[PDB]
Symmetry: C3
Subunit: 136 residues, 3 copies
Amino acid sequence: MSTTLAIVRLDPGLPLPSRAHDGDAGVDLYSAEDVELAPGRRALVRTGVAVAVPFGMVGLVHPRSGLATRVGLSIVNSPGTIDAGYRGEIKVALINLDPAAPIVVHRGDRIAQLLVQRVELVELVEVSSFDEAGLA
Amino acid sequence: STTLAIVRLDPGLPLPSRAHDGDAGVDLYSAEDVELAPGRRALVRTGVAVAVPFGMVGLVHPRSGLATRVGLSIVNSPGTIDAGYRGEIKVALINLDPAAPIVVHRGDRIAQLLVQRVELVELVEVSSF
Amino acid sequence: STTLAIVRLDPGLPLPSRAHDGDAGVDLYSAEDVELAPGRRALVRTGVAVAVPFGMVGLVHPRSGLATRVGLSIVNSPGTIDAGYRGEIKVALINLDPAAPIVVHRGDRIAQLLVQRVELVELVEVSSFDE
Ligand SMILES: O=c1ccn([C@H]2C[C@H](O)[C@@H](COP(=O)(O)O)O2)c(=O)[nH]1
Ligand SMILES: O=c1ccn([C@H]2C[C@H](O)[C@@H](COP(=O)(O)O)O2)c(=O)[nH]1
Ligand SMILES: O=c1ccn([C@H]2C[C@H](O)[C@@H](COP(=O)(O)O)O2)c(=O)[nH]1
Ligand SMILES: [Mg+2]
Ligand SMILES: [Mg+2]
Ligand SMILES: [Mg+2]
């Protein structure tokens, strides 16, 4: 039993991200733009949404496993980390890892998936050494 | 104390195991021999299928030794295994080295599998932040 | 509300810190000056070691700004830091740009460290799944 995730469609022309099956970890995010990535090239692509990740959680942006195999699409900073206080637009750093074939992304194509998990907001405690702290 | 049910689709590989008690992952083996030229990728079978419980997610992470040593990565890292998936775990291996091919043989440890809780949030559209 | 024991192996770097209260990671610093030629990688010392609690995992993620602006990535992203690991955290940086080098300085923020719970699942072999 979870909470909600407040989401804004900055681009009202794209579908609302949704969970394709009940247990699926992620919701698909769409591209708000048309872009062509030549081999080895990247772009920062707008998804047309902003979210409010709850305090104590994190949003995580993962690549889609299909396009990964089929054409080599990946995310430079995978997993992209969406902090709880971030209210800006989610943008995805796509990259074409194929050596030869460009990748054409159309507005409205699914380009990544977004997960939400709890994160432990640890307090760091400096210790002189693991030995002196009893942590061998 | 959670159990992960697992099928050895390939009975000739060892069962994945957790090498030390608190290690986050269990290592997955390759069921095949593959050779990756610089910059090339392959979808490699592990020989196993799993049953990620509802409320959880399976995560396929690259191994650090091979990453540094030969440039071995995973295109879709972290590879996401949904609770509903009962097919074979396949690893989208890639050679990020510019010049040296990567050899993988059957039986090699090619990735690690983590299981975590996931928050199955209900998206609610709102006007603005 | 967890704590994380950390050692500064390199005493001349700032202790990692959490920039804003709910931010998922603490940024890790390079202990070294390296130039990464296009497509090339390097194992970069961060100057710290940690004791990830039992039942948890430390995760090393790339920084998003550097990822776009220059193509800096991490080959084993997300880097997996096991609870029993007491060595130095090292980051496997890789310049995924086709043409421009990346200069990394000592003191630059080069990755972030998240700590999450992990399910230390007991693998149990079955003949088949229930259909
Ligand atoms: O490293 C991986 C990642 C995913 N999958 C399988 C399991 C997922 O539930 C399904 C994902 O398909 P997508 O909807 O992301 O394309 O594929 C794998 O075998 N290995
Ligand atoms: O895939 C990503 C990753 C991050 N960010 C946004 C949200 C983060 O909370 C913020 C700052 O990123 P960093 O400087 O921490 O890496 O950028 C994205 O839009 N997409
Ligand atoms: O980014 C990383 C990833 C791993 N390690 C260390 C810690 C791990 O516990 C150990 C084992 O590596 P793996 O094969 O589990 O990834 O290497 C690092 O210093 N940095
Ligand atoms: Mg999916
Ligand atoms: Mg290990
Ligand atoms: Mg940050």
